[PDB]
Amino acid sequence: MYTFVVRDENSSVYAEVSRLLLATGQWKRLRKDNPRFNLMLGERNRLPFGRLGHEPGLVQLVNYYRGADKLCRKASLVKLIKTSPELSESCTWFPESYVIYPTDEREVFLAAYNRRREGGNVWIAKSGILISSEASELLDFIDEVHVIQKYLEKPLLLEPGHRKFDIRSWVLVDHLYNIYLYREGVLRTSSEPYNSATCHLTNHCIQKEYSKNYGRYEEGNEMFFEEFNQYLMDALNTTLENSILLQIKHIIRSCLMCIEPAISTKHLHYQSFQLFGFDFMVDEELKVWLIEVNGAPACAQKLYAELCQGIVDVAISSVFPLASIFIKLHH
Template sequence: MRPFTSTAVTPTAAAAAPASSMSSPAPLRKAQESATGSAGSYFLGSSTFSVYEEMARQLREEGWRRKTETAIATADFILGDRFHIPYTLLRVERMALSSWFGGTRWVNYFEGSHRLTLKAAMVQLMKEVDTHWAKWLPESYAIGGDQLKKADERRALLDALAAAGDDDAVWIVKPSSGAKGRHILLLRASAVPEWLERLPECSRSMYVVQRYVDRPLLLSNGRKFDIRVWALLVSPYSIYAYTQVSCRTASEPYDLSDITNTHAHLTNHCLQKDAAHFGEYEEENEMWLPQLQSYLTSIGKPADLLETRVLPAIKELLVRTLLAMMPEIAVPATEAYKCFQLFGYDMILTEEAEVRLLEINGSPGIAERFLTPLVRSMRELLGAGPKDGTGSKTAACNSDDTCPGRRRTSRAFSAATPATGVTRNWRLEDEGFVLLWRRGDARPAEAPLHRSDADAPSSTHHTPGTAVASAGATPTAAAAEAAAPKVIMSKAQRRKLKKPPVVVTAEMKERAREETRELRKHLRILKSNGARRKVAKLREKRPREHNINEEAVNAFDTDFRPHKKGRRLE
């Protein structure tokens, strides 16, 4: 597996950078503060998402002004509801160059990111763009929707059940837009066909039917746990991960023979808090990676298992999934806004410590102990960190491309010249964001994610009787193409690239104008004919019964017809 180069950005690291590289030029800062006041402005939507509520609280305490919904286009920070952000308005209404971020604004959701956070859409996307999805995603099928418009994967699911021939195998059914563990079912393979029969043929609801990870790594007393990783996506397209990872634990021992006990199989806090043994083993049924590593070491696992095997697999999984959406949600540099979004990745470890992705949340909850420092680190990455003693803003940008913070500050750090205190490794004891990937970095290799797959036969394995090229031989064009980084695109994007570019000529424009004029003329005639038909129906009725006299009918006949430039259309 190709190693990743990581860059950790922490509040202390940002503060430790040289003042010349982290503060705004004095004249520009004075002009900015005179134009916008001592602080910027923000808009907060009605959703109760703890991360953005905490960000709004911090901004408010530092003097930022809250804008109403009618003035959302003038806010420097837009912390809106994910499906009610007016992206079209933000493209048109540009910010002044004297604004807090120098002519742009930050929006807290990427447009179209729901395709990654809706479970069924995520499964369909990964199957389209990643040929190695089965290495890190359990066998999954998107079920539901209107079958008359688009058939789902129920036929493939039934074929897989028949091929496996194991009626006692466990499958998990999750609503595509579900959250907090609600409406999740655990079914035996023999019960899945019956559930499919009860599903309406035409439905707006979508589900994911996923093979249950039935051999997970267990904690003390044989309890199950999963991993919540917080990933941050920032414009220009840069991927971060928060180094502190939460392990959510179950309250009851794992028992595959009893799939009705949700306290043993589902680790969501909303479900576990009602368990009789909640908080008995870990506080709030939550532990962290250093604690997990200590437990693994105590049962004979390698002392560096998490840092050398689990964390690299998590890094590649995060990058692989977020790059799958890059062609669709990346914000062009010409837009009048930039986006950032925090994702919550739920993963599980198998008995062999292999990482499996369960789902991706677009509005994840944050552990209370890390809520404030995580939000503060996010703000510093976005160039809106707390003011230092001189009144200048700390800003740590993430790419060599145009960054809002760099409109008024010099570059904070880069891969070639890292700032003081910046580390390149994801260590268990760190607290802050780690840079996993940004524009210009190599894409993940098409190699398997886990060591256990490294011994599998590959296409380059030498078989007897075949010639082996020498190390110094010049690679062929086919070999060079195969070794080149793959661009991850969906089928729709590939079809779009195959279409030849359209060259618009003056003749084409004139023909389009003529067709438009003819169409408008035809529509006026249709409207005129419709008015005549209404008049004819009125004349067929007796005026006295409807309190309409003949003069009114004649006036209607004269005035109802559409006019153009004061002339009646005949």
């Protein structure tokens, strides 16, 4: 009998994995502070990594990579891409970005911002968000730590509706640092016509709150890959795999391989896996841009069952065998 503990009650993904593990009959759930576990489903913050892997006779596995926050915080990601030769100042799939502190790259941001105006200079400040062409306004918003990023002025727009979207991809990294891209992604769509001058933020919460047109084109402003691929074929004579997924797989690999020496648990006294949510924008030319990486993603409702089973099969039972939905991104 394998044992596990649960230390993040607010996780929809690991609630299901937990339910699945119990249903096997070969896993038992311990009190959260019992140290004799095989598997820790950890808390989102200040996870006690230093206490893992010091239990005689237990192989111990945890569902986070220590250090993965470098990818999963806005400011850290910017710094990581600029200062990693593997990614470099010249990296063509990440929008121009600068770290700014209220009350730092401020000067450098202006230096290239002045370049922009003489002679398209819309940017976005991320922490509530503010999109503006006035540099002066953005800096004020920050003051009362943020990133300032070039706002994609020419998004790919879905028809009917003339509406923007973003793509979420789910990536599982196992204890061997195998990189697994889940088959199914989701498009988080705006239900409003994109207005050049609620309709700029594809956020699911924001759409539900502020959009009259929430849900008309698709269930809960979510378009899945089968439909989107069919749309790409009909409107643009191409495929999801060719126009977009090739780039997406390139970006995911680049990011995670960059960070591998720093966070790999290959020769460590405990082991890690982690589920990531990568978010992408695509522009008019079918170029894919990375927006951000989420270290603790939720999942789309109709994908929970399959994804979570996949986590158990690949990340957990691989280490603790009982008695594919993923594409392996080969290094």
